[PDB]
Design a protein around this ligand. Sequence first.
Ligand SMILES: CNCC[C@H](Oc1ccc(C(F)(F)F)cc1)c1ccccc1
Ligand SMILES: [Cl-]
Ligand SMILES: [Zn+2]
Length: 209
Amino acid sequence: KCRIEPVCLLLHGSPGAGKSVATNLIGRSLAEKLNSSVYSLPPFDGYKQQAVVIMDDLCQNPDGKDVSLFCQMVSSVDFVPPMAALEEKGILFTSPFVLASTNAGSINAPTVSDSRALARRFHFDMNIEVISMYSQNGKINMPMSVKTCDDECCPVNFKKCCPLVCGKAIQFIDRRTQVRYSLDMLVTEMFREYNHRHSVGTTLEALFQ
Ligand SMILES: CNCC[C@H](Oc1ccc(C(F)(F)F)cc1)c1ccccc1
Ligand SMILES: [Cl-]
Ligand SMILES: [Zn+2]
């Protein structure tokens, strides 16, 4: 149990809510801070210890295999993804971030213990809301949402701003506290938690716990 636990995000949205756009942008911003890239987990072909793993469109009813793998990934246990069937060598999983999206209001695992294990691991658990101006027919308008903002915007974690970044088009709502974030703000939060987990103070604290 020598690995720092990945920082994990779950986004709940609807099919047209731009869930995958959101995880892609959050993921890329975080990955760039670590000089790395994003890897989408095929539901481990192509995994190369990328800093950010994305799991898009989690089903509402994961089975025991889904639960088991996810709980390996998001933990402090050394974990070698299964690669034998791909005839590739075993390598330790080291991604410090895992982002997931789902259309489910609530994920329901097979047992309530399983549900507790998932809840423990989704540190950030947010609803996506698309702002009505930027949605037609239940589908987010990407041309509108990617259009560069004027200079009233100066983003923290991106080189330029658009409504996707600063909360004009999409917002993220904490499911426990109802606190609201722009995508940019959420990246700041996720990287702060990463820095917290990797700090000397935190790691030395664990010697006494
Ligand atoms: C095989 N069952 C559906 C595939 C699977 O769905 C999942 C649903 C939930 C979870 C968990 F456990 F909540 F993390 C993990 C996976 C999934 C979805 C997207 C990416 C990887 C795996
Ligand atoms: Cl149980
Ligand atoms: Zn903006």
